[PDB]
């Protein structure tokens, strides 16, 4: 079908079809433009006219301009060939490395895994990260709220995860930048590169990059997450791996939703968001799960508005999170990295009924001690570290060892940390903390535990430390 | 023109608040749909498309740059209002000024705790 443009009002184009009318969600291609202009279908205004939202500037459009129904929604190059490449909302390359040549194309708008495809069980997804794995275990096909921003190892952590997923699960990763700052994108690009996760020379790239820059119109920043989603889905539905999905940042998704909504003239709901806030979110979130074929795990960067946890945006979002990973500037200040907060970070799966009594107990152990020490913290500084009991003095010692044992060297940061990375195993993780709690290493000194892998290294470090 | 030709240019937008208002006026008169604060659904886009134009080029392109100092006027310190929210979210940092500070004798009234520079030291000299 070949339709005409009947009206152009900002980012909302109306297109009339003489013969066949494109269903909602289809992707139309504007004829005669320097660059590709995709109009997504949004409504059937009646009278053979559709109401669409432009995926880029409608500058220059002319009533009467020709529009070609691509006879489908936005489809994109999916597959391995995507890995290490940067791609647009409509699956275009934006890295200047030539065409993304894949066999399959995958429409972005996809329904979610039927009930009968659902997994019936909770399984922790190991990352090899002591804090994460021990206190706030990720969950297969679950959603993680990643708090904290700059200065704190946000990118480095994002990069280790990627690495560790490729390593321990042979699973690839996708990176969706929803409302990315052009400056920051390019900076992420070269950062991944320098760390290997991306490889311009070979075919060893472990990440595919999807970008929806901040200049892009609401509709584009509205879809980019889906696009990235489509990509990840492939490594699950076609190759049954355990993909990783990063959405940065989940807030800009929602925001992009409201903008599109408003443009479509619908009445906003509470706090100005879209009346379809919950649906907009669910039709997306729900595609992120463990099906029988594999699983997609999503790391979502969250931005809470007005620091208001009950704001509709954030509130809605929590309905889908299985765990939070709180990056903390303070922690970073102790030199501790990853700068994850062992007391603020949480996981739904931290249930003995799920992680097993052992795992559950250790965790609950590490936390209490961490908590107790926190109490004493106030006393120590004021009244001086001495009314401390044979007991009060051990909780501290241990805690201090613990706090350190919770830190760790990332392989991603080897390039210029001059230190070898460590991918501690869940078994090793429980053991390690188990013993410290136990009192096995009370004789060991603090610094012994700083920046090491498995407890064994804590022991050797002590050696080298006389 | 400067940026592209190996040169360096600084730009001050004073204010982006007034511009938003100008845009809003037009939008509503054209009868487009109003959102929070009566702002059109593409007011964010209006600034993002503006503020992104500033950037540091590569030598391959001339090494020239365009730095931007956009001004936003808050109301009763409400950084979370609509337009302030966008722009804060778009830029690499903020220099937060306070009246309390100002009257207290701190001039310029920069609230050091709340101000930021994502770029940071990567822009500071070794001396500094």
């Amino acid at each position: 079908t070949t339709g005409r443009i009947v009206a152009v009002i900002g980012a909302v184009v109306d297109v009339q079809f003489d013969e066949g009318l494109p269903p909602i969600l289809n992707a139309l291609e504007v004829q005669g433009r320097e660059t590709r202009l995709v109009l997504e279908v949004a409504q059937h205004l009646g009278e053979s006219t559709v109401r669409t939202i432009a995926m880029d500037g409608t500058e220059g459009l002319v009533r009467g301009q020709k529009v070609l129904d691509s006879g489908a929604p936005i489809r994109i190059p999916v597959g391995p060939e995507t890995l290490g490449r940067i791609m647009n909302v409509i699956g275009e390359p934006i890295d200047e490395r030539g065409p993304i040549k894949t066999k399959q194309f995958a429409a972005i708008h996809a329904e979610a895994p039927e009930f009968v495809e659902m997994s019936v069980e909770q399984e922790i997804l190991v990352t090899g990260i002591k804090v994460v794995d021990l206190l706030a275990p990720y969950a297969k096909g679950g959603k993680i709220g990643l708090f904290g921003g700059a200065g704190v190892g946000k990118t480095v952590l994002i990069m280790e995860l990627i690495n560790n997923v490729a390593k321990a699960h042979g699973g690839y990763s996708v990176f969706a930048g929803v409302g990315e700052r052009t400056r920051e994108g390019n900076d992420l690009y070269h950062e991944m590169i320098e760390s290997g996760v991306i490889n311009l020379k070979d075919a060893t790239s472990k990440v595919a990059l999807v970008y929806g820059q901040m200049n892009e119109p609401p509709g584009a920043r509205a879809r980019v997450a889906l696009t990235g989603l489509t990509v990840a889905e492939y490594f699950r539905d076609q190759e049954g791996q355990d993909v990783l999905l990063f959405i940065d940042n989940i807030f800009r998704f929602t925001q992009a939703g409201s903008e599109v909504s408003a443009l479509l003239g619908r009445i906003p709901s509470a706090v100005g968001y879209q009346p379809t806030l919950a649906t907009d979110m669910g039709t997306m979130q729900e595609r992120i799960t463990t099906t029988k074929k594999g699983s997609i795990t999503s790391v979502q960067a969250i931005y809470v508005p007005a620091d208001d946890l009950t704001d509709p945006a954030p509130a809605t979002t929590f309905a889908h999170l299985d765990a939070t990973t709180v990056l903390s500037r303070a922690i970073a200040e102790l030199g501790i990295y990853p700068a994850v907060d062992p007391l603020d970070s949480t996981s739904r799966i931290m249930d003995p009924n799920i992680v097993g009594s052992e795992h559950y107990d250790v965790a609950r152990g590490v936390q209490k001690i961490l908590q107790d020490y926190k109490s004493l913290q106030d006393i120590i500084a004021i009244l001086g570290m001495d009314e401390l009991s044979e007991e009060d003095k051990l909780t501290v010692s241990r805690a201090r060892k613990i706090q350190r044992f919770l830190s760790q060297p990332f392989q991603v940061a080897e390039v210029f940390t001059g230190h070898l990375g460590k991918l501690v195993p869940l078994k090793e993780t429980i053991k390690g903390f188990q013993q410290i709690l136990a009192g096995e290493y009370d004789h060991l000194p603090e610094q012994a535990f700083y920046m090491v892998g498995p407890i064994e290294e804590a022991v050797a470090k002590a050696d080298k430390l006389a | 023109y400067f940026r592209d030709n190996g040169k360096h240019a600084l730009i001050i937008y004073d204010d982006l608040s007034k511009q938003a208002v100008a845009y809003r006026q037009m939008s509503l008169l054209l009868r487009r749909p109003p959102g929070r604060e009566a702002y059109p659904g593409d007011v964010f886009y209006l600034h993002s498309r503006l503020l992104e134009r500033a950037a540091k080029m590569n030598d391959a392109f001339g090494g020239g740059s365009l730095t931007a100092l956009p001004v936003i006027e808050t109301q009763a310190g409400d950084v979370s209002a609509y337009i302030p929210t966008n722009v804060i979210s778009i830029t690499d940092g903020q220099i937060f000024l306070e009246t309390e500070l100002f009257y207290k004798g701190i001039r310029p009234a920069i609230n050091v705790g709340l101000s930021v520079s994502r770029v940071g030291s990567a822009a500071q000299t070794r001396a500094m």
């Binding site: 709220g145 946890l309 954030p314 939070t324 709180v326 | 409400d78 950084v79």
Partner: peptide, 15 residues
């Protein structure tokens, strides 16, 4: 209040 959003993710361990 007014400029709180410049803290940030402050009550995060509560979510």
């Amino acid at each position: 209040x007014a400029x709180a959003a410049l803290x940030g993710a402050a009550x995060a361990g509560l979510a």
